[PDB]
Paper text:
We therefore pursued the structure of the RBD in its unbound form. We solved the structure at 1.61 Å resolution using experimental phases obtained from a platinum derivative, and at 2.1 Å in a second crystal form by molecular replacement. Crystal forms 1 and 2 contain two and four molecules per asymmetric unit, respectively, and aligning these structures reveals variations in the N- and C-terminal residues and in several loops, reflecting the inherent flexibility of these regions. In contrast, the β5β6 loop, whose functional role is evoked below, is highly uniform in structure, suggesting a comparatively rigid element. The strands define a continuous sheet with simple up-down topology, forming an imperfect β barrel that juxtaposes strands 4 and 6 and extrudes strand 5. The C-terminal helix caps the barrel, packing against strands 1, 2, 5 and 6.
Numbering used by the authors: 322 to 448
Write the structure that this text describes.
């Protein structure tokens, strides 16, 4: 029931993409970087999936540019065949921001489904 941070990692997918974050000051998209985006299912000692995370490091420097858990109230939409818009928690404890993930048509489709289905599943987690 508790996330310890030492959960085992099950990589659901890895995809080349560009990450943009919405700048509330300029009302525009700002590129944060490009590289491999990873969706991970984190396993408990009971093989339960305590949470899922989207993690991304920009290529070259490998600086962390996205590291967010998925949550039930998360807002996601397929903005286009090649882009996904999501609300996510930002990297240095900074709050909820709106992101744009840009990738190939095929990766976008698979990613949207993977995230959407996980969000729905999280909503079923009422006791
Ligand atoms: Cl988070």
């Amino acid at each position: 029931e508790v996330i310890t941070g030492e959960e085992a990692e099950s990589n659901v997918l890895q995809m080349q993409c560009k990450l943009f974050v919405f700048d509330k000051t300029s009302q525009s998209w700002v590129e944060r970087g490009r590289g491999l985006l990873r969706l991970n299912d984190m396993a408990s000692t009971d093989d339960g999936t305590l949470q899922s995370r989207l993690v991304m490091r920009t290529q070259g420097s490998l600086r962390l540019i996205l590291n967010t858990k998925l949550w039930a109230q998360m807002q996601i939409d397929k903005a286009s065949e090649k882009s996904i818009r999501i609300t996510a928690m930002d990297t240095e404890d900074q709050g909820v921001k709106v992101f744009l993930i840009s990738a190939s048509s095929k990766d976008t489709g698979q990613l949207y489904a993977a995230l959407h289905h996980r969000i729905l599943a999280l909503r079923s987690r009422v006791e």
